[PDB]
Design a binder for this molecule. Structure first.
Ligand SMILES: [K+]
Ligand SMILES: [K+]
Ligand SMILES: [K+]
Ligand SMILES: [K+]
Ligand SMILES: [K+]
Ligand SMILES: [K+]
Ligand SMILES: [K+]
Ligand SMILES: [Mg+2]
Ligand SMILES: [Mg+2]
Ligand SMILES: [Mg+2]
Ligand SMILES: [Mg+2]
Ligand SMILES: [Mg+2]
Ligand SMILES: [Mg+2]
Ligand SMILES: [Mg+2]
Ligand SMILES: [Mg+2]
Ligand SMILES: [Mg+2]
Ligand SMILES: [Mg+2]
Ligand SMILES: [Mg+2]
Ligand SMILES: [Mg+2]
Ligand SMILES: [Mg+2]
Ligand SMILES: [Mg+2]
Ligand SMILES: [Mg+2]
Ligand SMILES: [Mg+2]
Ligand SMILES: [Mg+2]
Ligand SMILES: [Mg+2]
Ligand SMILES: [Mg+2]
Ligand SMILES: [Mg+2]
Ligand SMILES: [Mg+2]
Ligand SMILES: [Mg+2]
Ligand SMILES: [Mg+2]
Ligand SMILES: [Mg+2]
Ligand SMILES: [Mg+2]
Ligand SMILES: [Mg+2]
Ligand SMILES: [Mg+2]
Ligand SMILES: [Mg+2]
Lengths: 97, 95
RNA sequence: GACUCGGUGAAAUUAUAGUACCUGUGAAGAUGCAGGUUACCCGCGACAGGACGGAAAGACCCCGUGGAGCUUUACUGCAAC
RNA sequence: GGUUCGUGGUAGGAGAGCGUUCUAAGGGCGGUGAAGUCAGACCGGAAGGACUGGUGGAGCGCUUAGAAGUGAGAAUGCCGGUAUGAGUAGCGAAAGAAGGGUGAGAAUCCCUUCCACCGAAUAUCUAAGGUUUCCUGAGGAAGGCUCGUCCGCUCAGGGUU
RNA sequence: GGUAGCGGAGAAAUUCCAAUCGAACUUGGAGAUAGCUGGUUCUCUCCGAAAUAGCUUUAGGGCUAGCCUCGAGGUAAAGAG
RNA sequence: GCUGUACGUAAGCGUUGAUCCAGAGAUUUCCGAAUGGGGGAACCCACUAUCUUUAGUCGGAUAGUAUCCUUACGUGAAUACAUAGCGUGAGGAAGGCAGACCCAGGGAACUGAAACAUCUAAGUACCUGGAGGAAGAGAAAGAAAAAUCGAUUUCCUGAGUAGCGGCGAGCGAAACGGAAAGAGCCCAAACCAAGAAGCUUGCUUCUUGGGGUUGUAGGACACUCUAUACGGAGUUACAAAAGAAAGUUAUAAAUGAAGCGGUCUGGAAAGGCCCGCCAAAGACGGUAACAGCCCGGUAGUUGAAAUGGCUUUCCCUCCAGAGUGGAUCCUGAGUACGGCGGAACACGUGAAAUUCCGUCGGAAUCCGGGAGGACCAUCUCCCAAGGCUAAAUACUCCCUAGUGACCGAUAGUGAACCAGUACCGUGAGGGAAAGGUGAAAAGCACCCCGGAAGGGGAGUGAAACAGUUCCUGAAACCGUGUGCCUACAAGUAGUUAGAGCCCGUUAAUGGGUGAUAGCGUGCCUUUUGUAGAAUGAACCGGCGAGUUACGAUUUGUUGCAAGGUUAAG
């Protein structure tokens, strides 16, 4: 309240809409994936069992924030281009679930 | 009441401690006993239809039952009491 | 009635009070401050200038995005026709 | 423990504490006298805390923590008590007097006599209403605007065919 | 005996409806709401304002800023004379 | 031992077993729904039957007699059969509360939006009706989505999200998920049988029995196999009403260890000191003061004639269920939907799905029908218009046992006391105040003043400065007495200097008083500013104002740390 002066929110406009089929994905980085011995297989179930993840919100997504040092096969719902590149460059491989 | 009219009695506590006497009355509505020679007390009595002479009278007053202990009429010494059944008649027992 | 005697015995009020006057100052109208002037202590009956006296959170005035009652071609409605 | 600069303060911010009620634990005093209360010329920088003595006559402190119905001088505050005015206003329309008597006590009660008041009423009946206030015998705490030996007051017995 | 409150009665005055009537009394919603007044209880120590701008169906209210306090920061020490 | 609180005197009963306690019975005036009729509450007046008294009237007992609903039966009109109506009998209800919880009908405003009307407050308060111990809801015409789940309810979350909204103030879910608790069933209809009513006249159309109840559709109807009590189920739904027995529990009770230990204080010992003891018992309370060992009792162990409940057993009662076909037939009609008008769903007509009410219209009915937030198609899920259903949930006038960092008599219930009283009011209705002798009445014999009250002694008691508002007994307030000052003086009343006089202390550069001298316009509030001729307070005492729940944010602390933490349960 501002004394009958028009409030800030009433002097500016509404914006947008909430989508109903919105998909938000659990965000995994590369730094975590150094925890595993090379040549093994990473999965959603494994990442939950290890407590890295609790909520598979609408899926998993692996982002290239950081670095890996280790060869790995990874499988998830969506990857970023850069993280795919880094995984391959370490000799890893990628599957899309 | 563990003490009854007609009993012989020892006094545990009080100013009249160590003394003994008979039980002349009992009041279980108040847990008091009226005992001879114990708690004698001076009543300032105006004359009336009885005690028409009036005066200061020494008479016994009641004292509490817990201040009192029973005596076995055979030993003559004071005894805490239990209860047993003789035949089909409950009784009082010394111990 | 009031006044004195005898009996009985309230009230409104009340910050504490050993409660003068003039002139002045001061929230601009002082029993209470200043400076001067008067004034031994305690009461009784009478008067009412002041205590901006008592009573009644001014009824005048203004304010409140307070209220009630009334009016109408104010607005929106309702019954009834 | 030192040096330098400071140390008026409303609204208001910040901090450190005093004290009350209760709880837990530890450790205590207290019928050879607790809390409380009364008086004191003691203590601490403050809120406040001890000591002594009297009264009281059975419970209460201290320590460290914790929790709060937490500390009043004002609200034309609320309830209770007591003042002030103040021995004041008032004692509620009216004619009483004296003698005898009762009685601890009499303007006030009872009796007598004179006097005075109402008299289309201040009389006699009776509804409504009130509900024992009627009668008798005792009584005088309170009530009665004084008084009281009296009462429509208090007690106890009766009384309405 | 009848008429009862969004009502009734009025030879009509806002008159009367149990000492209340421009809309009874009581109980409840109800601790109505009150930008209004009043009040708000112990101590010390440090610091210490404002009564301005702007906007406001706003003017004795409020909001933001200016002014106070407390804490933490950061340095190419920026403040003051 | 007893004849209550409740003293008293009188008179009496009790071990040939009282008073008392528990269970079941009996009796239970009059009023009140109040019911034989009336009625101004607790009053009045009756009738019909049988009996009784009187010489007979008069009078007395006992039983029945309300209204409505349903049901039979009998009478019975206009009107002719008949129905209405009337009467009788068998059942049933009526009314009250616990100011609580829930279901429906009806339904505000104050307030908030810093006006206000949509909106909010709020489907709240209130009225009314129905109830029941819970109610309501409920066994998918569901929730959902590349995967399915399997009745309802309640809780945690989702989430203050999605969204609604003068898109303002504000209103605000649901599902998934996780838990408590768990349970599933019955009709209708086709179809068979009987009966009656129409003769719908060889067809219906109503009352009962069987049959059957559902979605990959199920059933009737055809067959096979079983089945007639083999076995199973049950009064908590699935049908309903009874009975016994056993055990357990509740409503009375019983038994129950150990110090009269010594000594000190003391009015009194339960306390101090020194010795012991018991403990499945050191709960509580009482007792002349603080008791495990004094009393009642507690732990423990026992027990109930009678009645009530629960759990089991028996009796009793009652019980066709699988399969394959699928000619045909059935599957909730004036509903389901739609229009109009309103409402409930978080959803304010908004694009407005879903549910409900009123009124208009008005389907298909299995190659059918609904929903998936307008709507269309496809897909998926599901069968409405009929009914029942425990448990988990909500509340507490009550009973039993118990608890409190709850009150402790201006508190705590309004009410610790004869309080919903006194009192106020015509009434509805409002509504107080008021606790404490003592361990024990031992409650002051007797004397004196006095008419009494009240005192002073005496005496009781530890104590009467504990004496019938009686533990303690503050302050305002009223007084008695006295050490110092005061009748030439004004002064917010004190302070500072200070003589003289008087005392002697928590002993310290002390106390009380103050001639006289200097200075000095209360407190609070609100104000630019108040001694203020502005406000408030008579005084004294008590009570009397930032708190709690949930959430946001920040600071500090602690723990773990790219981890941390669990909620319900
Ligand atoms: K005057
Ligand atoms: K003392
Ligand atoms: K009235
Ligand atoms: K039900
Ligand atoms: K005890
Ligand atoms: K709609
Ligand atoms: K569905
Ligand atoms: Mg504006
Ligand atoms: Mg005069
Ligand atoms: Mg005014
Ligand atoms: Mg300062
Ligand atoms: Mg308080
Ligand atoms: Mg005068
Ligand atoms: Mg006079
Ligand atoms: Mg005349
Ligand atoms: Mg008389
Ligand atoms: Mg008198
Ligand atoms: Mg006029
Ligand atoms: Mg309200
Ligand atoms: Mg109010
Ligand atoms: Mg300063
Ligand atoms: Mg408003
Ligand atoms: Mg004592
Ligand atoms: Mg539809
Ligand atoms: Mg519509
Ligand atoms: Mg709505
Ligand atoms: Mg319709
Ligand atoms: Mg859709
Ligand atoms: Mg008291
Ligand atoms: Mg009270
Ligand atoms: Mg006293
Ligand atoms: Mg002189
Ligand atoms: Mg003045
Ligand atoms: Mg005043
Ligand atoms: Mg006061």
């Amino acid at each position: 309240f501002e004394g009958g002066q028009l409030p800030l929110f009433r002097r500016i406009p509404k914006r947008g809409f909430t989508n109903i089929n919105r998909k938000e994905f659990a965000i995994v980085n590369l730094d975590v994936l150094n925890r595993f011995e090379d040549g093994t297989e990473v999965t959603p179930e494994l990442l939950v069992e290890t407590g890295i993840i609790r909520n598979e919100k609408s899926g998993i997504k692996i982002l290239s924030n950081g670095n890996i040092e280790k060869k790995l096969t990874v499988k998830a719902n969506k990857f970023s281009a850069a993280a795919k590149e880094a995984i391959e460059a370490a000799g890893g491989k990628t599957e899309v679930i | 009441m563990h003490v009854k009219k007609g009993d012989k009695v020892k006094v545990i506590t009080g100013k009249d401690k160590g003394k003994s006497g008979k039980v002349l009355a009992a009041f279980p509505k108040k847990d008091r006993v009226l005992i001879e020679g114990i708690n004698m007390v001076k009543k300032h009595t105006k004359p009336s239809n009885v005690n028409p002479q009036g005066g200061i009278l020494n008479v016994e007053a009641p004292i509490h039952v817990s201040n009192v202990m029973l005596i076995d009429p055979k030993t003559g010494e004071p005894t805490r009491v239990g209860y047993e059944v003789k035949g089909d008649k409950k009784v009082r027992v010394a111990k």
